[PDB]
Amino acid sequence: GPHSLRYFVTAVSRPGLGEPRYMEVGYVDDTEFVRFDSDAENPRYEPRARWMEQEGPEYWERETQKAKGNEQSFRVDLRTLLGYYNQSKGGSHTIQVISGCEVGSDGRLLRGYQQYAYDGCDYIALNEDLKTWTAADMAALITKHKWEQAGEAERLRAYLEGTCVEWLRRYLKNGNATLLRTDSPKAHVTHHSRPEDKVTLRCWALGFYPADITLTWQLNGEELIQDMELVETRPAGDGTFQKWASVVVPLGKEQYYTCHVYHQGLPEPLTLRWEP
Amino acid sequence: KAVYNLATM
């Protein structure tokens, strides 16, 4: 399979209540491995995964500084967008960054990216050629012009082509036993009453990794994606995920609906109908 | 060397 390093960084002003909240979370494949939070007691990059303890003192101080630097940068960023959008100093605003790179199993760059948004909406994002920028609106068009002038894009391609892929590689190895594992899902179905002589069949899938999975309800050779109802796959609080999908069938004929679970740890999909 | 040195807008 392919893998990826993923940063989720947030800045958010709180006028009247001091400097902004700046946080940074880092993910190698659905596995949280790093965190920074300017609201901590002693704000410092901290491990979120045993395999990141391995890293020595130097790493943690470098990340913690370039983090503190980014924090400062978004303080500036936040005032700047105030002017751009002609917004008044008195409100609370958010900047968001998604940054990282995915690679293939040969370990080569597959794709890189860095995306910014302000107050929820897209602002500006590096295109896939790792050269151009796509601006969301004319405000983020100024930022664009700034960054073409400052060779920020070719500077980012050095980080993406280089730093990012080479540490993803690092991480995948440091933590091969964790990141490269495969927990198969265990599944069941629950039954629930409903007015009008109808019945709800929920198919649960639990304790699995990676997060990617598919559940379908079938009936005599055709899926019912439309008359289904699922929940986004979710973290279960221990580095595993779970998902459930339900379907409304008529009482007496629930025996004929079957559930299907597709996943990396499932050589063959799972098929289950009900526990009368 | 892990996370990015973020630019100002």
Binding site: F8, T10, V12, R14, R21, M23, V25, Y27, E32, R48, S92, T94, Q96, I98, A117, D119, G120, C121, D122, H188, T190, H192, R202, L206, G207, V231, E232, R234, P235, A236, G237, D238, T240, Q242 | -
Partner: protein
């Protein structure tokens, strides 16, 4: 823009009285990010609560995870109450073993 939390409350494993478990309160698709998340046992607030798995979607809405260790009991009720700017009052979601 404002967007309302989707609060889902769920155990790591299927509940079994007297057996250890994680209790989950996944709070998703919300914006702005300022949010207050308390897990409750018998209407009381649980202290030992870990936050994790913060992230966004292409949408840009926020996703964060509260979880704590817990041991099910037939009588014990668990819940999640969240405060956000998109909500009249604090919304509290109860845990449903049967679901």
């Amino acid at each position: 823009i404002q967007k309302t939390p989707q609060i889902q409350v769920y155990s790591r494993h299927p509940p079994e009285n007297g057996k250890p478990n994680i209790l989950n309160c996944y709070v998703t698709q919300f914006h702005p990010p300022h949010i207050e998340i308390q897990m409750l046992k018998n209407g009381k607030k649980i202290p030992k609560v870990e936050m994790s798995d913060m992230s966004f979607s292409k949408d840009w809405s926020f996703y964060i995870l509260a979880h704590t260790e817990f041991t099910p009991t037939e009588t014990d009720t668990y819940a999640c109450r969240v405060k956000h700017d998109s909500m009249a009052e604090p919304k509290t979601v109860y845990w449903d073993r049967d679901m």
